[PDB]
Design a protein around this ligand. Sequence first.
Ligand SMILES: [Mg+2]
Length: 117
Amino acid sequence: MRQRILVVDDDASLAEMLTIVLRGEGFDTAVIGDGTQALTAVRELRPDLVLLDLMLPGMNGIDVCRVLRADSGVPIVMLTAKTDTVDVVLGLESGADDYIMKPFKPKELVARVRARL
Ligand SMILES: [Mg+2]
């Protein structure tokens, strides 16, 4: 079976782009736009890696990271924008393995994803 990446971002357009690009790189993808549905998604989907937007509707990325981190050791990479008010390092401390600045070169994102797997 191919590796699975769960994308948790409220940016539907960006998520579609990640879907296409990641799928093009040989991965399978699933998308959720809300933090509250992340735990269930992870438990059900069983993703190899989670790409997690730091600022989300419902639960925020740091909060989501904690819950996920509590459930398992699945790798989490934060997606963060320079605009974001919350500090991404806080997310790393909550257990995320890495982070990426938005917007990004898809090529760079895939590489980092491959590196944290
Ligand atoms: Mg956002």
